[PDB]
Amino acid sequence: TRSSVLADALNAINNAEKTGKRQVLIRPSSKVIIKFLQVMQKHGYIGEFEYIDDHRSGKIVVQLNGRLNKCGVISPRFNVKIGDIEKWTANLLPARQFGYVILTTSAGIMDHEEARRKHVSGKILGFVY
């Protein structure tokens, strides 16, 4: 049974990038998925994406430009303190400034650098690099 829709979306995006497809279909959609994709969009790893409404959970179509090396979800969503962020960046990213660790903090879903600037913390959703 479906446990994490975000995991399914990120896996579909990774597979589509691997195969060289220029665009991918993600089903079902969600607010968390849309915010994650918006973070990736802000950092340029993905292009334009369009949400299709069918009176159900919904669907998404994402344009891919081939700039994405990897995107993943960290399940379970561990509670991350401000001190503990650097540990996660060391563990998940191939280098220090290569990629981003995305957190759902009390101020929204954001990359770890924005979290450090805003001095917030929360749970960890995944990473993109």
Binding site: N69, A90, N91, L93, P94, A95, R96, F98
Partner: protein, 140 residues
């Protein structure tokens, strides 16, 4: 003149270290930063150096090794020119150390390590376990 028996009395901080092609793979595999990992291992500023042979060697690798190619082109990593036709990096790396005794060799190939070992006064850096290790460097 730079060598006292087997002790090199010229290599002093900050160190100039040649990056081998395979060194980047295991640096990525072990999630070890190039610039800081060398800083931790030696407790000194390190100037990584990438030659044309290794750089051409990386580009031939393919799309799979794009990350290594991106790291190799980081602005902090200086580039070393080559005045030789052959593109084999191992032969190039052995050549440079023979000419001038100031370079650390960062690599993980068993074969290249043995050839450098026969040359006296060449510190030989490698990545193993969780971080970098330096073998023939008394100042450590």
């Amino acid at each position: 003149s730079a060598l006292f028996f087997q002790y090199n009395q010229a290599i002093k901080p900050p160190y100039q270290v040649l990056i081998d092609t395979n060194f980047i793979n295991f640096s990525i595999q072990k999630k070890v930063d190039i610039v800081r990992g060398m800083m931790d291992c030696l407790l000194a500023k390190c100037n990584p150096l990438i030659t044309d042979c290794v750089m051409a060697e990386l580009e031939k690798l393919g799309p799979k090794y794009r990350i290594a190619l991106k790291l190799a082109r980081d602005p902090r990593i200086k580039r070393l020119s080559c005045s030789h036709k052959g593109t084999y990096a191992d032969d190039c790396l052995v050549h440079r150390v023979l000419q001038h005794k100031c370079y650390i060799v960062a690599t993980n190939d068993a074969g290249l390590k043995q050839r450098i070992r026969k040359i006296p006064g060449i510190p030989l850096m490698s990545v193993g376990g969780h971080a970098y290790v330096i073998e023939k460097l008394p100042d450590v």
